[PDB]
Each structure stands twice: as C-alpha cells, then as structure tokens.
Amino acid sequence: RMRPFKRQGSVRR
Amino acid sequence: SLGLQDFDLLRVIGRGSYAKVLLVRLKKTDRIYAMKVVKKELVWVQTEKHVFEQASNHPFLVGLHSCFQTESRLFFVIEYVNGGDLMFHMQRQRKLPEEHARFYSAEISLALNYLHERGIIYRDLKLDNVLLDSEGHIKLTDYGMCKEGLRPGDTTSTFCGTPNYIAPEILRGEDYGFSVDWWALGVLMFEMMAGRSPFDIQNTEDYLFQVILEKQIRIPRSLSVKAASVLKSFLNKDPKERLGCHPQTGFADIQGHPFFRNVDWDMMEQKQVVPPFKPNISGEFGLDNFDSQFTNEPVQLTPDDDDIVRKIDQSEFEGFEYINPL
Ligand SMILES: Nc1ncnc2c1ncn2[C@@H]1O[C@H](COP(=O)(O)OP(=O)(O)O)[C@@H](O)[C@H]1O
Ligand SMILES: [Mn+2]
Ligand SMILES: [Mn+2]
Ligand SMILES: [Mn+2]
C-alpha cells in the first residue's frame, strides 16, 4: 500500500 | 477473575508491535469493549496495569475495565472508542486546519498534564495512540512505554517510543523527564497542520535518527505566525529551552502561548468545547472508522505452540487478574 501517513510500531531497547 | 469465556469476539480492530486489539462484548451485561491482547513471548505489567487504573478517572484517557490472562497471552479489557484514531482520520483528511489541530492538541495537553502531574511519562504520543470518540473528542490509549513513579525532579534513561516521535534527548543518550511528551506533541502538531511528518519529507532508521537530531524543521509558508512559533517552541532540540519543559511553569507556558490563546482550558477539560469534526459512525459498531486491513482478518485467536509457550516464566504474571470496582 501507499499512504500519506504510515503506521509505525513502537520500539523499546 | 474474568476470562475469555465471558467475552464475545466480534471483530479485529487493531494491530501493533506488542498487541492485537479486538472488538469484544461482555456476554453477561451486553456492554461493548475493546480488548488489548498481548502475547507473553514479547513480554512493565506493574506499570501498564496501574496506568490503565489511573486513566479510568479522566475524560481524555482510555479506562481499564478488567484484566485477565491465559497461558500464552495477556488481556486488557478497556473502553471502545468507536470513532477510530487520528492516523486513520489523517490519511483521509491529509491535512488539518489550525483550528482543528489546536482543539486536539489542547485536549491532549490536558491529558498529558494529568499524567505528568501523577508521575507518569506517556512516551508514546503518536497518531495511532490518540482515538476519536463518537462525539468528536479524543482519548489516549496504549500505555506500553509509560514510566511510573516520577517524583519531582526525576529522570529515566530508557530508549523507547515510536521512531518518528523519539525526542533528541533520547537520541543523545541523555537522561530525560516529561520533556519527551511535549516533543512528541510537537511532532504530532506538525503532522496535523503541515500534513507530513517534519522528518520524513546509518541509512534508513538511523537516517531518520540523524535527521531528527541534525535536520532543521522547515515550517511551510502557509502556516500562521502563531502556529509556526508553537511548533518551533515544541520542536526545540534543547529540552531546557522547550515549551512545557519549564520547571513549575510548564503547563502554564503552554496555556499562555499565542497559539493556545483565546482557548478556554477549563471548558475544554469539562468537555464543553464543540469538536470541529464529528466522526461518521458507519457500519456495525462504527467499524467503518477502522482500517479494513484488520477488520477483514478472521475474528479468532492465533493457535498456540506448546513448545514456545512452555518457556514462559509464569511467576511474573501472578497478580494480573483484575476487575475494576466502578
Ligand atoms: N480502546 C480502544 N478503542 C478503539 N481502538 C483502539 C483501542 N485501543 C487500541 N485501539 C486501536 O488498536 C491499535 C493498536 O493498539 P495499541 O493499544 O496501540 O497496541 P500496540 O501497543 O501493540 O500498538 C491502535 O492504532 C488503535 O487504533
Ligand atoms: Mn498504538
Ligand atoms: Mn504499546
Ligand atoms: Mn471547520
């Protein structure tokens, strides 16, 4: 898919 | 304690890096909720539960109904916000007027302050984690990065958050406080009004990390002088110079800024301001306000692997069972 805003997952390290 | 046998599985409404969110119904009392399903192979637990507890007594926070667990998963029964999230309602709108962004960020600011003044650092403010209700207001969900126990003047060092929203303080390996939530609100407000992340338009995620640290935020010429100044004051790379990061005078500074002037914060806290956008609750339970990549997945739970689930140290989830007593 191609969209203006992309779903980003949170990171923890 | 409640259980999976007491809930009706309706639809899959969300997915993240830690959990799968399902639309559920308590079979006994016909009430409609959302259920955050967290697998224990990824997995805090003291913090995310206790933060859902606090959030239940606030208008702009998602509240906790009950907690229960299975051999493979952890379940969070929370409220159901049937208008979707800001991300969904931003890929359609593509860009918001400053009057609209001011409304959402003001309500977020109040919710954030309530967390800040209780010792909690949200540390994951993004489009996905803000939801629109049936009337047009907002609610904050997903407290996976939340910190707990911040007595006045404390700092933490955990590298966490969403890659686009991580504050420079974290990127510089510094200790940080609530300052990281007002940076994310800055990045969020930039997305609402400009229509694009201020960092998107060693080489792909660490490229963003250097951009976030070295690149300059370029406000488009179509924005107002008050909007420009509220972004430059929230996206200030120096936490000691940022808006809202003013010891004792933090929230007051955010309420006194030209952008957040002419705004009534006490009517806003009391849900007396009229939303600029009222969600179009279409479909069953308002499911046309959620992406079809999730509402088309089969409504079920993924089968278990007795070889993978036999490694989980279940002596860390002892007191997870919980039922909110009103
Ligand atoms: N109470 C809720 N009501 C409606 N939608 C929700 C609710 N909680 C989560 N969601 C949806 O689920 C998605 C991901 O859930 P989230 O709690 O962020 O899990 P993760 O921590 O895995 O990202 C969000 O983008 C949001 O749209
Ligand atoms: Mn989320
Ligand atoms: Mn999370
Ligand atoms: Mn309007």
Residue numbers in the entry:
A (entry chain F): 2 to 14
B (entry chain A): 248 to 290, 298 to 455, 464 to 588
What do the paper's sentences say?
Like many protein kinases, activation of aPKC requires activation-loop phosphorylation and an αC-helix conformation compatible with Lys-Glu salt-bridge formation to bind ATP and serve to align residues within the R spine (Kornev et al., 2008).
This efficient PKCι substrate closely resembles the aPKC consensus motif identified from screening randomly oriented peptide libraries by Cantley and co-workers (Nishikawa et al., 1997). Surprisingly, the structure revealed that the F-X-R motif at F−5 and R−3 engages precisely the same site 1 residue contacts (M341PKCι, M344PKCι and L381PKCι, and D339PKCι) as the F−9 and R−7 contacts used by Par3CR3, despite their different position in the primary sequence. We also observe an R+2 side-chain bridging contact between phospho-T412PKCι and G398PKCι main-chain carbonyl, making two key hydrogen bonds with these groups. From the Par3CR3 structure, it is evident that the F-X-Rshort peptide does not inhibit PKCι because it lacks a C-terminal inhibitory motif.
